[PDB]
Amino acid sequence: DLIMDIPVKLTVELGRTRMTIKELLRLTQGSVVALDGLAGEPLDILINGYLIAQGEVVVVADKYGVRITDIITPSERMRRL
Amino acid sequence: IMDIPVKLTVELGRTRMTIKELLRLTQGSVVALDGLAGEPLDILINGYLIAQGEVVVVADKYGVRITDIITPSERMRRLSR
Amino acid sequence: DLIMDIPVKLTVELGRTRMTIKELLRLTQGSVVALDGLAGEPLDILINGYLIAQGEVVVVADKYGVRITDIITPSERMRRL
Amino acid sequence: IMDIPVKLTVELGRTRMTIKELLRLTQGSVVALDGLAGEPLDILINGYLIAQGEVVVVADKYGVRITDIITPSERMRRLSR
Amino acid sequence: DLIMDIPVKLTVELGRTRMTIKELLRLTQGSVVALDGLAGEPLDILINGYLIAQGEVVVVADKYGVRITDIITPSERMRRL
Amino acid sequence: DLIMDIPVKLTVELGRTRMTIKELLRLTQGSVVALDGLAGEPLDILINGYLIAQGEVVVVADKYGVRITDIITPSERMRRL
Amino acid sequence: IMDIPVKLTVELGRTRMTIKELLRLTQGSVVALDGLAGEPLDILINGYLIAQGEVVVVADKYGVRITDIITPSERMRRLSR
Amino acid sequence: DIRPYDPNTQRRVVRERLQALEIINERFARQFRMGLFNLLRRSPDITVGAIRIQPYHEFARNLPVPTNLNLIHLKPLRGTGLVVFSPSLVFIAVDNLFGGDGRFPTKVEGREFTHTEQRVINRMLKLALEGYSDAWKAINPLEVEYVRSEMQVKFTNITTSPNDIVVNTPFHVEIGNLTGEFNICLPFSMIEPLRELLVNPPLENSRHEDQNWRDNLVRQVQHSELELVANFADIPLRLSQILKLKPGDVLPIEKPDRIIAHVDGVPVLTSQYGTVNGQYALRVEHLINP
Amino acid sequence: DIRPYDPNTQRRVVRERLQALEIINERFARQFRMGLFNLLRRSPDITVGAIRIQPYHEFARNLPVPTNLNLIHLKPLRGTGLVVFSPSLVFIAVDNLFGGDGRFPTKVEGREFTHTEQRVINRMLKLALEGYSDAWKAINPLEVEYVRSEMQVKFTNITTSPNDIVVNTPFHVEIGNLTGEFNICLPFSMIEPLRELLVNPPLENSRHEDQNWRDNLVRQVQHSELELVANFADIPLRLSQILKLKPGDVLPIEKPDRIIAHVDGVPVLTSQYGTVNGQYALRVEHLINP
């Protein structure tokens, strides 16, 4: 079926971390928290919270975008949960 | 009060697009996000956006220095887009 | 292909109306506002704000559920434009 | 009091004409509007004219500096034409 | 049928913007707001709020008018909604 | 051709009368003014101020509607001119 | 008190004549009016004479400088002729 | 004449001739001349130049820098006016006032006005304001109040926009061999309510005669008929329906409880509909009144 | 334009023209000039340079070391501003104050300000603060309070981050042959609430006229229709279900006791649903109000 004009929401996550209530509250103005992902890693392209693609960051005429390098394989989907 | 951990995420930007370009996507396909280059990235708690902050690299690691906490008016402004 | 899952968000709209700021601010407790949808007219179904179908509220074993009267067409989309 | 967004529009002028010239229209067909060159363009809120203001160009973008807010007398004077 | 002597209303839109209650109220005397359309774009020729033509601005003996360049096609009618 | 939709505004006039400024300003609460239209005479229908038809008020399943007694003609338009 | 517009007219003069010369009229036929050259032209409101005033030309446009408002005696005197 | 319109083409053609403004200008010129004689102990002559109804930006672009710009209040008219005192005029006034006979050449290099120069400007401005109020009183009495003084046209911003149409009146004052200028700048919005009075002066016996004229006018226009059209109902359709429309078609309509009576489209009253004497009639509930 | 984005590329392009800030700068420059004349007994001239809306780090990187950095409070605006007093300016001021005629060459080698130099700094800082408050009062009255002084840009940290966009205003002061500079540094967040006022100055008669304008604005925008969309229910599905979906399918749904009415996605009110006149209707229980 080609009911296919439907629009979708695309997001890009720079990084993630697991972190608890106390140091949440301890975070203040100008507080910086390091991300789990090491610099240069391809970011995560999510669809409604669902990942299908990975890609690095890029700027296209002052506009944000990602250069995708891997999109489709679920063989690694087991570890990211 | 409670000592529960939460999965923080940092979101680079948004993208409203139909699945035309989604199926047309491939390695090297250019994608543009809603956020222009320069504005603070969004700090989300369990997927709940609560803050905005600037991206920095420390010890060759991604990090975000939280610049401000968001307001309901800006929250609805970002929602209605 | 790989898009078979793609968590989508489907919403149904109860009705629409043409009303201005005066009465809008003059809404009070218990005040009733009518909608352009006739009682018994199947409600609209929207995905990301766009037509996907028309569905009617039906009693299904004490569980009200929406039964799809019809699927949208490009022609009807043009007409309801 | 409320934080609702509205679609503002700016109107260059009016034109009362029968569909003779409408069907005679083509690329290059000259059309004349009701408003002469120089008078403020009309600022409308959700299609409701509320103001008059002069047109300017800033950063190679169209803009309007609101000169005055309209009065019911001028409003109906415009309508009865 | 040729019941066609009917007169119709023609309007020209210089530009549009989506903008909210608070900065509405913040607009004051002499306040200028930039339009979404970039300068030099063909304006919108509306009929009773319905668009059929696009065209740039022109002055014809101190009288406003538009030079129409595109009139008929519904192919782009989906995006402008 | 492309003009098949062209949202038009149709109005019906209840009646007309010849009356001056004295009595006009001397209208009071509950005062009744008669019109030249005889009771049972089909009312006129106008579009942008011009004749389009003559229609009569008919009871249609508790819903009063206007049933078109006749369509205007150039001859009758000249006669009523 | 009320904001109604009226169609003012300016009348050059009167002429009482039977339709003899009316049917004898042609391009170039000399006609004489009741008013001699020099007296103020008549200012009528919705066809109601209210004033008398002198004719002037300003910016190559006809205009009347109202000289006096009439009296009932002069009104009836003009009528009885 | 087929040229593409471009912004900032303020082709504002608003041509009038304010004879009453001219007469007020002449009366104020005489009053200012006598005041200048009283102060400077010397007799000036003041020539009233042509009235320039020009955009504010164009007026300001010709103003020499620096200059005295005095904001004034034309009560009860909404808005503010300006008095332009030229450096040459202020120089000549101070020179005459403080011992100089004025025989020396006028050396205007461009500098701000000192406190002493400010006070001299204040005095001549007070005299000018009094003379202008006296001149205007013959036509319309008003109160003129000094607001403040400025050196730059950017300090003033007399209009909402620089393209706003404004009235300027120049005066060339000569004393012996020393020439100067001073200007009166009033926004066209200031005089728009009184445009009718300023265009023509041709009335001198009008204190209660104006009231009599207005009473005659109203009592005589009260005999003019109108065109009451009562829109019974309002149906929105499309042009396809209009083209295919045929007699006998019934068009659904929301039930009109209130009928609007309008003339030339202009709403006049709200009423209920009915039948009397065999004719349609309207019983008026409320006239359209803001 | 296809280049890989990298962090610390603060390509912050926020271009505006604060005419009201410029006018306040000029008024404060005149006030500071007269104050400097009062104190130093010598007449300076102050040139207001172009306003630099630049990142805080870029502003600080150009600041000479050592220098005087005075933290100030722009009440009631949340946050703090800075006054930069240059070593050359402080040197010249102290030299003039303490017997030196200033004819000697200025020898700035780089050293901290002594307590006497601190008192001189305090004095002309107080004069600058008073002049700046006077200049601003014409547009917005505010209270300026001295916080403390610092010698290094790292002592200040005026912004949350060095990449925060900040407004700087330089002033070049000349006295005889001795030149100095002093700057006013206010974070863009300070003026963001008043950005609309600072961009354009084109209003002079606005004390109750602003209230009248606002009342007209609200009473005229109260006649604009909106787009109420009431989301009756919310079913989450998957794209496979959407593709295979066929008419007559029933979708389970949690029972909506409350219907949210929103416009353009922005929630407006909470209500109950029902039927009246044969149409769907909403009885409002609570409007969306924070």
UniProtKB/Swiss-Prot annotation, chains B, D, G:
Keyword annotations: Bacterial flagellum, Cell inner membrane, Cell membrane, Chemotaxis, Flagellar rotation, Membrane
Keyword Cell membrane: yes
Localisation per UniProt entry: Cell inner membrane; Bacterial flagellum basal body
Recorded topology in the membrane: Peripheral membrane protein
Main location: membrane
GO terms for biological process, alphabetical: bacterial-type flagellum-dependent cell motility; chemotaxis
MF terms in GO: cytoskeletal motor activity
Similarity comment: family membership: Belongs to the FliN/MopA/SpaO family.
Job description of the protein: FliN is one of three proteins (FliG, FliN, FliM) that form the rotor-mounted switch complex (C ring), located at the base of the basal body. This complex interacts with the CheY and CheZ chemotaxis proteins, in addition to contacting components of the motor that determine the direction of flagellar rotation.
Protein name: Flagellar motor switch protein FliN
Gene: fliN
UniProtKB/Swiss-Prot annotation, chains H, I:
GO molecular function, one term: cytoskeletal motor activity
GO cellular component, one term: plasma membrane
Membrane topology per record: Peripheral membrane protein
Compartment(s) where it occurs, according to its Swiss-Prot or TrEMBL record: Cell inner membrane; Bacterial flagellum basal body
Keywords: Bacterial flagellum, Cell inner membrane, Cell membrane, Chemotaxis, Flagellar rotation, Membrane
The keyword Cell membrane is assigned to this record: yes
Cystine residue pairs: none
Superkingdom of the organism of origin: Bacteria
Chief localization: membrane
Similarity comment: family membership: Belongs to the FliM family.
Record function comment: FliM is one of three proteins (FliG, FliN, FliM) that forms the rotor-mounted switch complex (C ring), located at the base of the basal body. This complex interacts with the CheY and CheZ chemotaxis proteins, in addition to contacting components of the motor that determine the direction of flagellar rotation.
Protein name stated in the entry: Flagellar motor switch protein FliM
Organism whose genome encodes this protein: Salmonella typhimurium (strain LT2 / SGSC1412 / ATCC 700720)
Gene transcribed to yield this protein: fliM
